[PDB]
Amino acid sequence: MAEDADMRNELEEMQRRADQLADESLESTRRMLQLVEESK
Amino acid sequence: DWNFEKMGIGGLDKEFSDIFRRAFASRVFPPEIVEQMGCKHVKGILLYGPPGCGKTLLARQIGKMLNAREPKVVNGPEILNKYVGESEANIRKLFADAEEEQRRLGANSGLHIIIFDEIDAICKQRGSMAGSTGVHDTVVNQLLSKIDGVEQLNNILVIGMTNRPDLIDEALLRPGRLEVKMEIGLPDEKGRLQILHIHTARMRGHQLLSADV
Amino acid sequence: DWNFEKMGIGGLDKEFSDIFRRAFASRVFPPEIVHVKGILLYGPPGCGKTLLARQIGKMLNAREPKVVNGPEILNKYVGESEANIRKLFADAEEEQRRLGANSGLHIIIFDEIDAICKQRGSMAGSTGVHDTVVNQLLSKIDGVEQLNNILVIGMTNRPDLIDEALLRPGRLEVKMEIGLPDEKGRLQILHIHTARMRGHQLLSADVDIKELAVETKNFSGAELEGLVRAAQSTAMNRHIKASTKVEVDMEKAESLQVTRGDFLASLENDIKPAFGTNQEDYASYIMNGIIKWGDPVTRVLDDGELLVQQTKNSDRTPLVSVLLEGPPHSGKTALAAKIAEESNFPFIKICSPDKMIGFSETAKCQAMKKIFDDAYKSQLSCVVVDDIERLLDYVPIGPRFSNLVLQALLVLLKKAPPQGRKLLIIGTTSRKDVLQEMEMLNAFSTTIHVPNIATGEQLLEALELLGNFKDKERTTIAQQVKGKKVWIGIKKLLMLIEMSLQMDPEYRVRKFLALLREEGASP
Amino acid sequence: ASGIIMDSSISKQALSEIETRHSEIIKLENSIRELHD
Numbered sequence A: 001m002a003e004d005a006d007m008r009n010e011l012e013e014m015q016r017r018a019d020q021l022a023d024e025s026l027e028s029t030r031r032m033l034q035l036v037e038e039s040k
Numbered sequence B: 001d002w003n004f005e006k007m008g009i010g011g012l013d014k015e016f017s018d019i020f021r022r023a024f025a026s027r028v029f030p031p032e033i034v035e036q037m038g039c040k041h042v043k044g045i046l047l048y049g050p051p052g053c054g055k056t057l058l059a060r061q062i063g064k065m066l067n068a069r070e071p072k073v074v075n076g077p078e079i080l081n082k083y084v085g086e087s088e089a090n091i092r093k094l095f096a097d098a099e100e101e102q103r104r105l106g107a108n109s110g111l112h113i114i115i116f117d118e119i120d121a122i123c124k125q126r127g128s129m130a131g132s133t134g135v136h137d138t139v140v141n142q143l144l145s146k147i148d149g150v151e152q153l154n155n156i157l158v159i160g161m162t163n164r165p166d167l168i169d170e171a172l173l174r175p176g177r178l179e180v181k182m183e184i185g186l187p188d189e190k191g192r193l194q195i196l197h198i199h200t201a202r203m204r205g206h207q208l209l210s211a212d213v
Numbered sequence C: 001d002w003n004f005e006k007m008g009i010g011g012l013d014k015e016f017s018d019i020f021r022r023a024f025a026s027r028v029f030p031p032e033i034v035h036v037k038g039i040l041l042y043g044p045p046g047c048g049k050t051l052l053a054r055q056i057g058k059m060l061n062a063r064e065p066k067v068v069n070g071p072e073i074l075n076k077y078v079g080e081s082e083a084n085i086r087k088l089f090a091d092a093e094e095e096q097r098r099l100g101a102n103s104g105l106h107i108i109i110f111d112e113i114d115a116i117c118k119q120r121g122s123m124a125g126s127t128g129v130h131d132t133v134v135n136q137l138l139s140k141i142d143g144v145e146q147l148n149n150i151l152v153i154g155m156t157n158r159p160d161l162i163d164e165a166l167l168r169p170g171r172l173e174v175k176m177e178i179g180l181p182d183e184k185g186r187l188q189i190l191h192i193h194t195a196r197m198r199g200h201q202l203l204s205a206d207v208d209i210k211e212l213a214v215e216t217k218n219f220s221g222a223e224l225e226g227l228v229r230a231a232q233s234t235a236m237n238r239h240i241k242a243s244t245k246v247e248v249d250m251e252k253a254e255s256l257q258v259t260r261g262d263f264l265a266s267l268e269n270d271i272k273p274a275f276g277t278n279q280e281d282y283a284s285y286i287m288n289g290i291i292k293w294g295d296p297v298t299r300v301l302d303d304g305e306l307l308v309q310q311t312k313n314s315d316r317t318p319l320v321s322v323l324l325e326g327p328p329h330s331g332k333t334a335l336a337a338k339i340a341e342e343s344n345f346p347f348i349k350i351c352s353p354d355k356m357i358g359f360s361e362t363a364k365c366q367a368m369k370k371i372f373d374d375a376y377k378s379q380l381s382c383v384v385v386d387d388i389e390r391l392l393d394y395v396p397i398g399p400r401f402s403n404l405v406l407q408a409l410l411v412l413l414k415k416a417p418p419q420g421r422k423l424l425i426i427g428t429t430s431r432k433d434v435l436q437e438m439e440m441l442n443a444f445s446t447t448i449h450v451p452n453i454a455t456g457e458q459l460l461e462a463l464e465l466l467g468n469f470k471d472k473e474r475t476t477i478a479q480q481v482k483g484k485k486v487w488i489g490i491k492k493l494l495m496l497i498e499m500s501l502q503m504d505p506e507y508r509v510r511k512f513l514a515l516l517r518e519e520g521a522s523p
Numbered sequence D: 001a002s003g004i005i006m007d008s009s010i011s012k013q014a015l016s017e018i019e020t021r022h023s024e025i026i027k028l029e030n031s032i033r034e035l036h037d
């Protein structure tokens, strides 16, 4: 949809980025904690 | 490769002569005398009339004869957007390549055409409505500022058509913005004959028309 | 410079000098003996505001002026408008800090400032983006930190939309109105734009710039430039011929002289002033002049002259009225208009029912009241009412008429004007048998009579003054009308003369006499 | 008493605050992976 589609995609990808990257960071922290506890 | 006969417009012969006289006289003339005369080319055309005589056909054929870049079309009011202050972002995206090529190639730039279809949907009188939003005023202000602002832009040509001339705001029709304005109306006997001859050439080409017509 | 003209501007010389006096005087004045921050411009479209802004920026030796092209500050993200607005004054604040009161002057251009400034944003803006933006600008310009090295110029084509809050002292101090130039300004603009022509003698000597300046009325500079451009385009296209292909002689091209004919064609054909025109039609009430077919005309005109003299030179009779009586189709309106014209008074008007079709009683009363009220302003004036019987529409059945209009007329006929002023009233009517019944004939001071043609000699004299028949035709007319009565009005006589010139010459006189006999009668 | 009217609405993307910066935690995991190795 030209400019309309461009903006809709931009904002949808922005919400995506937010949620997905937050979840990925949470998973990374989980793995970090698990390995740190394992080494002991 | 151009000729008036190739164009399908018939019955509108004075109008085209006037448009050519008042719009393309300067560009065709050799540059030296033009510079010696120190004149500025026109930057607008307006067309109006009752529903359906020659408007869109004339605009398309005019845009299809210049050996310039492809024109940019705007089908009705497809500029509006639902986010705050984004109609302007779409308006300014039209007059974008023109400024860049003005900066790059000095004063030998080509010609850029913009065809505003149904211009009365966007550019109404300022403060006319009593609605709950004020996007139309900002759109009109941005268009007025960009068409002729402090920075001189002189390699564009804007064409507009409508069915209601009186609704346009006067500030958009002062000599310099949209000066040449024309009226297309019903034809007469010679015009009718020319039109019927234009639309019946191909059938007569291969003898598909009976002799008694 | 202060040339007032080297910048290609005209008509604002006095206001340009006033700007010099009121804006930059403090900067010009020596610092030993010792500002303006807000300048606003307004005027109708096409007057030269942007030219003033550009020349003002160029004139002073300061940094390059900054510009904003309409609403380039709005954004869809929260808080970006304020950041963009505050990005502007960083240099001003830094220079203030660095150089105290020696900071260089700064110029900020707000083109089409109406886009930002308005009476608050609409409720459906989802926030106060408009109000918060205007408040941020107001605080920055009028903050507690007071700078003296910034000048802001605003321009708009419609001042009524600017919020009043920004027009108070300390924000917008100077206001300028740019109006329509004058005849001398038109001459100056034409000279500026035709200097390039006159440099190479490409303009025909047949052109008189004074005539053009006289002709162009209510033209702004842009419209005059358009006229000149149209003339140039016509002159250029005279030498081009592009119907099969684009072609130019290239030999008979040097002449290329724009002639007065080109200017006239451009003015008449493809330009419009964009302003209305005043209409004058009072010459349409006398379409055939006045011819003295007899003595009575002289007496009527003499009485009118005496009445005018009395009203002018009287002391305790500021108001005078007269009635013009006569049979139908006798030419009473023409004589009344003539007598009004001969008075040479500053104010004259004609009240007729031709302009009131479909009006009710109240509208007629209001219109007559307006006309008389206007007439009550000049020192001495004359007013004429014709076809009274059609003003209070009267029909012999019943009879039926309008009471409100009759009472309005009877009240207005005996109301003196303000102290030391003179008014004259002339009324015309064909049937006086009714006005005497309504008691409206006693208000008028005096009455004059207008007769019909009553003798063959007068008819023949009128024919001669018209010059239609001759020789045996007139001789036979005389022979047949030297022992008969004639009762014809001049208008009816003209109608008959027009009627009888449609058949062949053999039957013309017979047809004319037959028509005269048919229409002839006695009182 | 004329009345009974309507209106239109617009919006604004107010969550401008960035989030990508705090999501680039991969390098710390890489370092601790090297430590575990």
Ligand SMILES: Nc1ncnc2c1ncn2[C@@H]1O[C@H](COP(=O)(O)OP(=O)(O)OP(=O)(O)O)[C@@H](O)[C@H]1O
Pocket: B008, B009, B010, B011, B012, B050, B051, B052, B053, B054, B055, B056, B057, B162, B163, B195, B198
């Ligand atoms: N003068 C003409 N010569 C040749 N063909 C014509 C002429 N006028 C109309 N036509 C034919 O009829 C069609 C009319 O459509 P056109 O694009 O001219 O409409 P329009 O004037 O833009 O209409 P609207 O009333 O919607 O503004 C043209 O495309 C062409 O097919």
Ligand SMILES: Nc1ncnc2c1ncn2[C@@H]1O[C@H](COP(=O)(O)OP(=O)(O)OP(=O)(O)O)[C@@H](O)[C@H]1O
Pocket: B148, B174, B176, C008, C009, C010, C011, C044, C045, C046, C047, C048, C049, C050, C051, C156, C157, C181, C189, C220, C221, C222, C225
């Ligand atoms: N008094 C004048 N002297 C010289 N040129 C003038 C004058 N008035 C108008 N013009 C011409 O008209 C144009 C002036 O318009 P400009 O672009 O400076 O802004 P403006 O008149 O404020 O515009 P707007 O119509 O948008 O309010 C230029 O072409 C200028 O040559």
Ligand SMILES: Nc1ncnc2c1ncn2[C@@H]1O[C@H](COP(=O)(O)OP(=O)(O)OP(=O)(O)O)[C@@H](O)[C@H]1O
Pocket: C285, C286, C287, C288, C289, C290, C291, C292, C293, C297, C327, C328, C329, C330, C331, C332, C333, C334, C335, C387, C430, C490, C491
């Ligand atoms: N000496 C004259 N006196 C009056 N009218 C004259 C004379 N010579 C020529 N005319 C023309 O005769 C016509 C007079 O018509 P006019 O409308 O004045 O008549 P009227 O008697 O007032 O009409 P009505 O009966 O319709 O009220 C006008 O064209 C006037 O120019």
